[PDB]
């Protein structure tokens, strides 16, 4: 983990996320959307378990991205919750929640749920 | 449970759902949206645990509603998963998933997640 998390990850759609896992559990990086143009980049911050079990368990982690940057403000945020599994073919399997700011009448349709698998390849 | 589930339930928004819990685990009924007009009614079918634990545990259940009827076809379905807790103030606490049929490109925004609490009052 930690060393193993640091790096670029790609999901089945092309989205790229680059994170630095710090000694003490911090996760910092950027998330870039498809196209990969200069700034479809957003900031991400998260935390992981820095002292995970020594058995073959995955490393629990999660991060958040607010979809606001200097070119776009989609008034929403997504959190990804999941675990990192290292090895020949390491991957982070996640479930995410995307919530958009709504008025109290539209709150019911505010959150979308999905899942993402990220690989280094 | 069973006898205790059968009946009308209301959620914090007014939606009314009437179910019949059958001896063997079946749940059948209708779901009516706000307004309460003749047919904002949709059919629901589900299953519950008919032999729940005798300790103070809740009764696990879930049902599905497809938002199609003779006046409206919203091309979507919602499933509610939760448990029934009986007593003076019985309630069914649920988490739901609402999925809309989308094209493969819009699948990412196909499912909304939320929660509902239903009471007899």
């Amino acid at each position: 983990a930690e060393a193993g998390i640091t790096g670029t990850w790609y999901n089945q759609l092309g989205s790229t996320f680059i994170v630095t896992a710090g000694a003490d559990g911090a996760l910092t990086g950027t998330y870039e959307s498809a196209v990969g143009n200069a700034e479809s980049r957003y900031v991400l911050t998260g935390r992981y378990d820095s002292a995970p079990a020594t058995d073959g368990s995955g490393t629990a982690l999660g991060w958040t991205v607010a979809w606001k940057n200097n070119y776009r403000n989609a008034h929403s945020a997504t959190t990804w919750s999941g675990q990192y599994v290292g090895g020949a073919e390491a991957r982070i399997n996640t479930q995410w929640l995307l919530t958009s700011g709504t008025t109290e009448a539209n709150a019911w349709k505010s959150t979308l749920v999905g899942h993402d698998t990220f690989t280094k390849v | 449970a069973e006898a205790g589930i059968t009946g009308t339930w209301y959620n914090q928004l007014g939606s009314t759902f009437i179910v019949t819990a059958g001896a063997d685990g079946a749940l059948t009924g209708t779901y009516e949206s706000a307004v309460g007009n003749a047919e904002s009614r949709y059919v629901l079918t589900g299953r519950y645990d008919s032999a729940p634990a005798t300790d103070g545990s809740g009764t696990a259940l879930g049902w599905t509603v497809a938002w199609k009827n003779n006046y409206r076809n919203a091309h979507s379905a919602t499933t509610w998963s939760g448990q029934y807790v009986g007593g003076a103030e019985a309630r069914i606490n649920t988490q739901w998933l609402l999925t809309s049929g989308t094209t493969e490109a819009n699948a990412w925004k196909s499912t909304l997640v939320g929660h509902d609490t239903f009471t007899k009052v």
Binding site: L13, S15, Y31, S33, A34, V35, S40, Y42, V65, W67, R72, A74, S76, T78, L98 | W108, K109
Partner: peptide, 6 residues
């Protein structure tokens, strides 16, 4: 489309 995707 939303940035998470595009």
């Amino acid at each position: 489309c939303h940035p998470q995707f595009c």
